[PDB]
Design a binder for this molecule. Structure first.
Ligand SMILES: CN(C)C(=O)c1c(C2CN(c3cc(C(=O)NCC(N)=S)c4ccccc4n3)C2)nc2ccc(F)cn12
Ligand SMILES: [Mg+2]
Ligand SMILES: [Zn+2]
Length: 312
């Protein structure tokens, strides 16, 4: 059935925008990802039969969680598509394929619990993955979905180019760990200021890819305000679910995960934009000038949060 899907013509223009909202097209999300893979890398790059199989299995391996779900993976995948569609000459064929696959798989089998929750309560995956717990799980889930019969869509190419596209995918998926983003963006800033950024250096591309992953992961702040406000409700309902599960253990959660501190949500959002969101899209816009509309939309949403704080 996914092979049969062809996207409506009225959305070919809209999806190319950075602030495009996949929200009201739930039935199309799998076909929207196919469309994006078909425009960024072309049809006949993957064998269509195995690609749709790989996609539909990835959706099934996403849990019915409030925010870190299937809607989130496609949203992140789309933002990567818009970034690659506006920087087309800079990323190789193996990169455009791998990064769009990475984003659709970057939160595979997430349970709605932070990396801290799993480490603080000795979850089995925290034993396996001591640091970047969920992100190592997501990559392992990706590899396992790939290695299924009829699912390996990079089987079509070199055993070297195969291992290359995987460590592109692992690096990208690991980079979605927000804790690693701060050290990543700081080193890119030094490389930018000192004029030391060489995109012909593998270590530098890897840093820049990671920032793109963060920008895509946070791209909920790059939508129009009505879209951004309602995605925030999903984010907090998942945080508050982890907090509820902490209050049931005699441990008070942080205010971010505390539903009884709903009133502090606008102040917390403004702090997040200034400490995290703005620095991310600012450095990405400095490195990739075409990606400036992300920073512009993020600024408009900061103003909106300010006006909620002021009652304005
Ligand atoms: C992983 N993930 C979803 C995020 O990280 C996140 C948040 C968090 C930060 N925030 C807070 C954070 C705080 C706080 O304690 N400090 C503020 C900072 N300056 S971090 C807070 C305090 C009281 C009440 C609510 C609070 N909500 C939710 N929002 C977004 C938006 C888009 C996005 F793509 C991602 N996110
Ligand atoms: Mg992740
Ligand atoms: Zn994510």
């Amino acid at each position: 059935g996914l092979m049969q899907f062809t996207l409506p013509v009225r959305l070919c223009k809209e999806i190319e925008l950075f602030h495009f909202d996949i929200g009201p097209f739930e039935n199309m999300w799998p076909g929207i990802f196919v469309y994006m893979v078909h425009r960024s890398c072309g049809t006949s790059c993957f064998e269509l039969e195995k690609l749709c199989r790989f996609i539909m299995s990835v959706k099934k391996n996403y849990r019915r969680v409030p925010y870190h779900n299937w809607k989130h993976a496609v949203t992140v995948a789309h933002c990567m598509y818009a970034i690659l569609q506006n920087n087309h000459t800079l990323f190789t064929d193996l990169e455009r394929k791998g990064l769009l696959i990475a984003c659709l798989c970057h939160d595979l089998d997430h349970r709605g619990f932070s990396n801290s929750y799993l480490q603080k309560f000795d979850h089995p995956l925290a034993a396996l993955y001591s640091t970047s717990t969920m992100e190592q799980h997501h990559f392992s889930q990706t590899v396992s979905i790939l290695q299924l019969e009829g699912h390996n869509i990079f089987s079509t190419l070199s055993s070297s180019e195969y291992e290359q596209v995987l460590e592109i995918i692992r690096k990208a998926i690991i980079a979605t760990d927000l804790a690693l983003y701060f050290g990543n963006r700081k080193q890119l800033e030094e490389m930018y200021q000192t004029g030391s950024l060489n995109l012909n250096n593998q270590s530098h591309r890897d840093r820049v890819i990671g920032l793109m992953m963060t920008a895509c992961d946070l791209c909920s702040v790059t939508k129009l305000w009505p879209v951004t406000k309602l995605t925030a409700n999903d984010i907090y309902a998942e945080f508050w679910a982890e907090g509820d599960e902490m209050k049931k253990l005699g441990i008070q959660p942080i205010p971010m995960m505390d539903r009884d501190k709903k009133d502090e949500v606008p102040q917390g959002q403004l702090g997040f934009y200034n400490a995290v969101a703005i620095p991310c899209y600012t450095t990405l816009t400095q490195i990739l000038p075409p990606t400036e509309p992300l920073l512009k939309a993020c600024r408009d949403n900061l103003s909106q949060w300010e006006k909620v704080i002021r009652g304005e």
